[PDB]
Amino acid sequence: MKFNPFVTSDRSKNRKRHFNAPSHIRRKIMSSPLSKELRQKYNVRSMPIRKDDEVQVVRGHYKGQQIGKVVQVYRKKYVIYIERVQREKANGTTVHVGIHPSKVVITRLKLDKDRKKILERKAKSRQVGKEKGK
Amino acid sequence: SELAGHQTSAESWGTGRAVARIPRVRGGGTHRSGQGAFGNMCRGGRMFAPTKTWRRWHRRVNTTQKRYAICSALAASALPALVMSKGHRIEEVPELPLVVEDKVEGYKKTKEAVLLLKKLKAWNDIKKVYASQRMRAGKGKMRNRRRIQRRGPCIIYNEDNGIIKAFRNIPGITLLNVSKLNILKLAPGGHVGRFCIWTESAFRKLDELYGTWRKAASLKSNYNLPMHKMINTDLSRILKSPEIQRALRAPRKKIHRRVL
Amino acid sequence: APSRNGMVLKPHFHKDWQRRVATWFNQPARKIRRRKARQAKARRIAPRPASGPIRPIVRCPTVRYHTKVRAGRGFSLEELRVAGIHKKVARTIGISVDPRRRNKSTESLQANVQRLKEYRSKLILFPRKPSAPKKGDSSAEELKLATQLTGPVMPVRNVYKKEKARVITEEEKNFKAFASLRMARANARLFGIRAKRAKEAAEQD
RNA sequence: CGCGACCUCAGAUCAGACGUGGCGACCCGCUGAAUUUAAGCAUAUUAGUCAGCGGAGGAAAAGAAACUAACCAGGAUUCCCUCAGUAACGGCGAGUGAACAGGGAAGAGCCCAGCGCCGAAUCCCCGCCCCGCGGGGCGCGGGACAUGUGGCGUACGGAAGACCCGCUCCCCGGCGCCGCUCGUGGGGGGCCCAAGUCCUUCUGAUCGAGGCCCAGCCCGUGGACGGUGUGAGGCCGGUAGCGGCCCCCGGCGCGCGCCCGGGUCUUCCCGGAGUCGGGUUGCUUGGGAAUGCAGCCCAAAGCGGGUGGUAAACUCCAUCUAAGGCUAAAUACCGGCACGAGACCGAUAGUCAACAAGUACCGUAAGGGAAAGUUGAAAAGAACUUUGAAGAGAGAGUUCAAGAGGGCGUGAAACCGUUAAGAGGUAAACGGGUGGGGUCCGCGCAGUCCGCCCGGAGGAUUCAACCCGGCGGCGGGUCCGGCCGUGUCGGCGGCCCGGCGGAUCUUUCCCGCCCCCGGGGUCGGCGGGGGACCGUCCCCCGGACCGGCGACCGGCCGCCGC
RNA sequence: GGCGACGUCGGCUACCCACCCGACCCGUCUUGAAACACGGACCAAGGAGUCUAACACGUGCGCGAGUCGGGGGCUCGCACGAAAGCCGCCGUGGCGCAAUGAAGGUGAAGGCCGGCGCGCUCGCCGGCCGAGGUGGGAUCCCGAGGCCUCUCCAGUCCGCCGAGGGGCACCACCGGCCCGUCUCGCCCGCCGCGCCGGGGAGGUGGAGCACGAGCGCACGUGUUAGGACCCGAAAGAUGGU
RNA sequence: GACCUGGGUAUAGGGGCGAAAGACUAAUCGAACCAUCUAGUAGCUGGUUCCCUCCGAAGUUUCCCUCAGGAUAGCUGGCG
RNA sequence: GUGGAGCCGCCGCAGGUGCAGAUCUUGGUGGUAGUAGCAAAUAUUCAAACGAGAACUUUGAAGGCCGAAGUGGAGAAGGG
């Protein structure tokens, strides 16, 4: 239950933040949870998706066990594209059909100088909360 | 609509050309050329007696009636019929003033909450609250109140030591302090007899805080508990007593229907 | 438009009043605003008292109310002199001073002075460092509390007489009667004419 | 006749600063109508308000009495509650209409001219360096102000000066910081629990079902939003004196600058002028033989002057010191930046404007001023083939669905087209009445009664009766335990280790005092504390009566399953 | 008791048609409408007795000679909390308990017994009480007398009870009492003997008394003032192009 | 010819201007237009949205700058 | 039968709560009706081309009209 006065509860405004977001907020709302095998290795729950994180699609029309890497992340439409899932036009041309990334599981991440540091702090800021049980 | 609805400047035609004498807008040009101006009748117009912000919203009830109703709601949770038939499943529960010890107010983790209400056979009410996870009838869904939810019991306490931290997550349940009560919480929606779980330190303070008829209460401090208008309220035991039926006439049960 | 038996009415609505209306939809929201203006002022200053300084003892000035006693404004300025405290240390001791006030009776003088010499007796001050120029020991072993409420020395304490039980004596049950009020009115409004006929007595020579 | 001050005045694209416009909801000053009311209408009402004009602020204005009071005297302003719809005003009509008390929010008081004293002890500026930031100070020398009066002490509650007595020697700014900060000052970014597990439905799940003796999991985290439909657990987030960071926020402590107060007696000083008042005229106010304010004229006084609500004279009493000034708080806010919420409105509503709305458009101009939201989950927006110059069709295809086809959700009524059925000389439609026909509906089709009991006919199982065992329940009963009501009291039991209450009591009880001559007389008490009595509530034993919805014990009758 | 299927039996809807009888078109003003009186081509949606204050009365609830916290204050830094809870040496205050008068002012109890000063229509004293009386007045109480398988022996009872008593609310009257004036009249009291107070008996004026009934809240109705049930002018005024 | 005509300028609402008709002043004139006060007042016309059940009238008195209206009684209903 | 995501009963509470009319307001559509109308200033005709398609376009040949105060050649103002 919300107790803070300084944060909303309405439908009229949360949608209005949701469609009129900036872009740096927009990657934060486009995350996908980590897989079961990988949420023990890093013990962290969710990551902001990027261009190389390979993924199987679990809930939707194309369900499960189809590990394929992402190719393009429409932030404007809150939608990723994966180079395995496709749909042909009427022309016979192929185009990528798009899916909303909370219905998507990362099987393997990408690492750089940034993702070693983000996965530090996102894992660090969990077991501090475990130390409150004294 | 406070006063403005009249920011459209217009006048009546003033002659019997062939239209009604309603005010018509000025100018030319756009589609709002000679249309209907203000008046309750017209499109884009003012409303009949536009409501005021000083309608008498807030209401007074003098406090001898505010206290008469809070006595008559706590004295309706005592009877099992007035608290089952409100809708609370108190079938399997033990004794209707459920009273637990003062050690319950040390609870600061809600796993200790759920095993409390299960062991008192009172969890079978919260399980009924989960049936009321609907969504609102009508148009409340865009005035941001959505999930209709039946109230469950209340827990009535004093000297909060953590009990509000343990029960405020359980859906559909309430707490209220036994010094600062609420007729809104005790008798929700007019129908009397909300189910309640008490505490030793709360079930004892009411004798100081409302009293008995033998003395005045020492916390409302100038109060006396209401006086019962009837002596014996079980009139089946009254009218089957031989002091009454010594003086009755008779029954008279012949119908004497209409004779042709 | 007037009908059967009723009340003649003068409502003051002919003047346009729909602009000068003042709704009190914030009279809760000001009470929760001016408790914060006290709670962040009760702890903000000091263990100096809240609810202001020590206020005087003052009797109400009309025929209607001269039987009761009111908290006033300030010690008049000879109570500071009788109790022997300087007039411009009195408001930083924490006593409120009203400069323009008269006193013309000892029956209401001494109830301030008895209060004022008792206040400083029930007072402790703090040193800068405990050199203590005119202060004793540690103030009551850290003063037992911090702050009072709604008046330091309970400014009303309206006190009354007893006169427990008496015996009717002779005179007392005879004299002090209705005719002890009539001629008090019949003389004090005829005091001037009867002396005017006592001016005429001389010129008869 | 020249020269030199000083006074008046000018000049400068001189050196250095200011002001002008914007907004206007709130605030301050002016000016200021008419509709309306009075059933007409002039006074009055509308209202000293809308319009007009000028000013600033985050609030402003107001303000430390030329006050209210008329008694046991209150004591800045502002705001709220009453006083009050009262006193009063008014063709005494309609109507308008305060304040003082009283209760609360808030509470903060002061300076200057003058009078008199201090050898102008004062300020500005220019330049150099003391020496430091993001800059100014107290040095020093120049120049100007200024004696027509700068600075100190002073302000009407008095103040100075001369004593004399006993005290005491300070504060404040900056500087660097540590130690804090009540929601733990404020902002900013970045993170913090738990199911996609089995089956099932679907275009798609967030559906329905399920989870061992812990009730599958997390709960200080079941607000909310998006996700292919209804989500505590899929993701942002919510909860939390949760976390880690980055900057800024008030209050220890060395170097500076400032730096004798109080009481008593004695002398001395003591106040704002074309203003107050008075006359006359207008405006206004509840102010009524003039409340306020202004014009014009006559114009003050020192035991004076102002006020004390009926004009004038006398007398007495009260209260304040006007014609100079400053001031936070409580308070008003429909413009502004941000916000949060709504027993609201849901696209002809809500503001005029949910969209490229003060836009399209009109008017020479002041100005007037709309219409217009929705495909789907996804554009997957109809490739390809045929006909026609193209519009548009036919196939094919996409989609669960084009019966969603680029103003595309749902798609009404008027209305029109077409198919069918019907009938058609007094225009049609209508009410009452049956008859004909058609659609569909049931019973269902000379095939429908349904249960109860009994007697025959064959068929297959086992009570019941009693008796044992059995746990439970109903109704009585010595109420023996426990019980509770009401009156009788007692143990005063806890009163001096009881509850609340009492204008019941006590001048041999205990403090601060007056009355009377270093003391006392209770000599009358007063401000105050106990302890005595009642009035009601707490145990004991003792009494009554019902063992009552206040429940159990055993024993009895008569039920009940297994 | 009788009659009968694979197309029959019953049954109607906002169904069509045919027939008989009846039938002028609806809202409105009006004594009078079908009117040769006015508005109405059709259909969808919008579209008109509201709110605030004040009062009056009826009803409902709480308390009741009192009632009312509406304004402040208290509770932790709580979403639902702009809620709810409490204050009482927070009752200040409202309205009511006390009316009359222009105003100074004054401000509501008689009864029964006995004894008396010319018991003199005037009057003085103690006592018991205590809201006066008359006529109606639901109800309640006494109730002569009656009423049961045989006559004499008695019990709680019941029912019909003639008459009589106490008498609620109220209605009419008579009396009393408080205040304002008026006629007549004599007496008393002394913070000090006066163009001083107090009283009496008659007759009137009063929104009075005669054992009080009000306050708060909610609802309905009605009336007023507010744009006031919606719509409507010729105007008028300020300020501008 | 007291003639006709282009542009510049002047005069603005109780005011401009007029060889005079109350003409003309942006199709508007016996007082222009735009905005507000203002939703101005109306004893006057027009309208005033669901069903059943019960009761169910009035046009007269007196007075009014009253005669198209209101007050008062009459008549009606609801509550007792 | 369509429709594709929300809705209703019951006890109470609160209303911007119910339409045939107001020369109502906005919007829509008929009947009239394939009717009235496409009539001021004389006037067109033949062949060819481009073209899916010609009374209306272009090109020719002829017939004409405005007729130098123009139905011509050029500007101001305005139009942008």
Ligand SMILES: [Mg+2]
């Ligand atoms: Mg709906």
Ligand SMILES: [Mg+2]
């Ligand atoms: Mg629309």
Ligand SMILES: [Mg+2]
């Ligand atoms: Mg159709």
Ligand SMILES: [Mg+2]
């Ligand atoms: Mg008709």
Ligand SMILES: [Mg+2]
């Ligand atoms: Mg005008």
